[PDB]
Design a protein around this ligand. Structure first.
Ligand SMILES: [Fe+3]
Ligand SMILES: [Fe+3]
Length: 697
């Protein structure tokens, strides 16, 4: 379940610690994984997503059955590197998941674009020899009414049609109620003048509808052909969230209402080949995402609030195309090795009728940029070749060198080499070392010279004057040399391991610090605004420790621990943080198999201190409550699963036994009328009872 760099979560695991709704809840408990925003602003801070080794969630590649999920690329990427997105780990319903693979650092670089942090591969339950199916229900019950309860119903059904043609289908309906509009009342940052009365929001709610169909066709003994279609729909339940935590009547009108809906549609063709020489796989996925939400402004304090002058919904459309071919070849030589060879092709078309609409009246005009009716359209194609050689030098030792080459049709050529070594020092002890250079293509917002944000000064680096931020098709890809050295003892279910990891982070893309130019014209003081671009930061570094320890107390009883400790996270240009994570994270489960038919689980999570950014948007040291830190805290939980028969199981338990609660005070830094909240940017839910029921043949 735990080796150096890699973690498996099983169906049994998902069953014993059931997630409310989103899988982030259980994925986050792996070594090296945190649940954070992408950068340090704290904006959309209750919209936290999976972060691997402090590299940010933009650098965590989500797969379902080896096929990319790109849906969040349909939400506007803002000035501070946050999207008003709930993430991409809530597309597959928990109880139809067979297992989840988390691959962190050098082992993950081979998966290419956006695996700089690592890969999360959500694997579905597949067709059997006989026909099987299940019906799963979960429902939680919070102590405090403010906090949103969650309800979940999902079914699965698979088997053969013929001797040579199988199917699997699943369908899910779920809802997570929003936190009450006022849950953060009495905890909010100091708010004065026009902003008096404003509130930082609790967690957005969501309604889910997921339907997947798959047909497997075994054409010959050594040939399988898979067809699947996927239809999902998330509509939110709004509870007052805005980028800057400003308010207006339109905001208040929409409390309790759907203000965004994401439709995600997937069709996939997969051919799987198995013959004497070796093995083949190749797939075509077409992902179509419709991001329908309410118009928001793109300037200063109006960036990320419902725009009352332009009321109503727009729809952003993401058409994502993925094709991949691989062959694996057993090879006999001076060393017993295996060669895998592969191409990959991806196309991302983005239609956004809202992001590209900032006009140049107030700040003056930009040479090369039309003020009105700029294109809605952005697109990027990567072509990729790769080979990986998995070389046995001698029993116990694998050396795995791989080369990936990527041609980005704007940014240019990338060379991502990799080397992964594992060494049996003993039967019980294994040393593992890895150094790879991973790859990040700029997102379609960073890349687009039509994409334009504006501030009168309050968000401008190194001045108080009006300034534009502009997309930059001149950008380099972000690369990271992910190093890792680890050791693990494993024997008779006794596991003890410790890994050190360092990712040297080159060309991290971010809102610029120096004006590249000035505009001409516009109104009064705001006239002739400074122009910044999305720039590559030369150097940043993350560094830390992953530990695991599993002790079998008795035959019936297992004590498991995962440790993350984050040593360093530094933008070497500004000296500020990349992300804000807990200094450490210790997850502790006691698993007692009390009877043949009863299992009992106690868990504790310890979170270390959390520190905010040192510098504001200007680059100036922040002061007062913008410096506030979150103290270390713990969350404990009990549960059980009572098996009534081979065909019926029940679960029940309590998350957060001792009701430790935290409250979003606002964003990290001060603005006019809204004091900063430092690290206090998210809501930690209180005591919550839950029950579950699973019927299966
Ligand atoms: Fe007034
Ligand atoms: Fe402003």
């Amino acid at each position: 379940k735990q080796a150096p760099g890699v973690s498996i979560i099983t169906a049994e695991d998902i069953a014993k610690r059931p997630p409310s709704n989103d899988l982030s809840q259980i994925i986050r408990t792996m070594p090296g994984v945190n649940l954070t925003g992408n950068s340090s602003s704290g904006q959309r801070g209750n919209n936290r997503q999976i972060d691997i080794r402090g590299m940010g969630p933009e650098n965590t590649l989500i797969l379902v059955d080896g096929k990319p999920v790109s849906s969040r690329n349909s939400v506007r990427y803002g000035w501070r590197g946050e999207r008003d997105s709930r993430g991409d780990t809530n597309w597959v319903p928990a109880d139809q998941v067979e297992r989840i693979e988390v691959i962190r650092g050098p082992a993950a670089a081979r998966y290419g674009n956006g695996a700089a942090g690592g890969v999360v591969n959500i694997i579905t339950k597949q067709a059997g020899a006989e026909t099987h199916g299940n019906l799963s229900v979960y429902s939680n019950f919070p102590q405090h009414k403010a906090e949103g309860a969650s309800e979940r119903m999902s079914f699965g059904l698979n088997g053969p049609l013929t001797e040579n043609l199988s199917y699997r289908v699943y369908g899910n309906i779920a809802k997570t109620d929003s936190d009450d509009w006022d849950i953060n009342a009495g905890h909010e940052s100091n708010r004065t003048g026009k902003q008096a009365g404003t509130l930082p929001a609790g967690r957005e709610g969501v309604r889910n509808k997921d339907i997947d169909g798959l047909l497997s066709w075994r054409l010959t003994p050594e040939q399988t052909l898979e067809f699947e279609a996927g239809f999902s729909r998330q509509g939110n339940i709004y509870t007052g969230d805005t980028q800057n935590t400003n308010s207006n009547n339109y905001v208040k009108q929409m409390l309790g209402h759907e203000t965004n809906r994401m439709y995600r549609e997937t069709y996939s063709v997969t051919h799987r080949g198995e013959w004497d020489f070796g093995s083949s796989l190749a797939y075509l996925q077409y992902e179509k995402t419709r991001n329908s939400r309410i118009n928001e402004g793109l300037a200063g304090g109006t960036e990320g609030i419902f725009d009352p002058n332009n009321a109503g919904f727009y729809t952003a459309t993401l058409r994502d195309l993925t094709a991949h071919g691989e062959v694996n070849l057993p090879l006999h030589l001076g060393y017993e090795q295996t060669l895998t060879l592969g191409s990959e092709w991806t196309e991302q078309k983005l239609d956004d009728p809202s992001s590209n609409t900032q006009n140049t009246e107030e700040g003056g005009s930009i040479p090369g940029l039309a003020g009105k009716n700029r294109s809605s359209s952005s697109s990027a194609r990567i072509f990729s070749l790769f080979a990986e050689d998995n070389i046995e030098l001698m029993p116990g030792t694998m050396l795995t060198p791989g080369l990936r080459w990527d041609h980005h049709d704007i940014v240019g050529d990338n060379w991502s080499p990799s080397l992964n070594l594992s060494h049996a020092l003993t039967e019980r002890v294994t040393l593992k070392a890895g150094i790879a250079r991973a790859y990040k293509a700029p997102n379609l917002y960073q890349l687009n010279p039509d994409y334009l944000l504006y501030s009168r000064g309050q968000g401008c680096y190194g001045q108080s004057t009006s300034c534009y931020l502009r997309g930059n098709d001149g950008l380099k890809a972000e690369t990271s040399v992910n190093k890792e050295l680890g050791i693990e003892y494993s024997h008779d279910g006794l596991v003890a391991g410790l890994t050190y990891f360092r990712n040297d982070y080159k060309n991290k893309i971010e809102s610029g610090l120096s004006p590249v130019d000035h505009a001409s014209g516009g109104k009064g003081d705001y006239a002739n605004a400074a122009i910044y671009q999305w720039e590559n930061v030369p150097k940043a570094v993350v560094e830390g420790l992953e530990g695991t320890l599993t002790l079998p107390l008795a035959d019936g009883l297992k004590w498991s621990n995962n440790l993350t400790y984050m040593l360093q996270s530094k933008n070497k240009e500004t000296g500020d943080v990349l992300s804000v994570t807990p200094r450490y994270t210790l997850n502790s489960m006691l698993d007692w198999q009390a009877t043949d038919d009863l299992s009992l689980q106690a868990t504790v999570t310890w979170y270390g201190k959390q520190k905010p950014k040192k510098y504001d948007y200007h680059g100036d040291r922040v002061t007062g409550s913008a410096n506030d830190q979150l103290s270390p805290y713990a969350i404990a939980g009990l549960g059980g699963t009572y098996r009534l028969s081979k065909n019926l199981s029940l679960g029940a338990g309590v998350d957060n036994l001792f009701d430790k609660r935290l409250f979003r005070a606002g964003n990290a830094q001060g603005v006019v009328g809204i004091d900063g909240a430092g690290a206090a940017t998210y809501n930690e839910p209180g005591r919550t009872f839950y029950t579950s029921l699973t019927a299966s043949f």
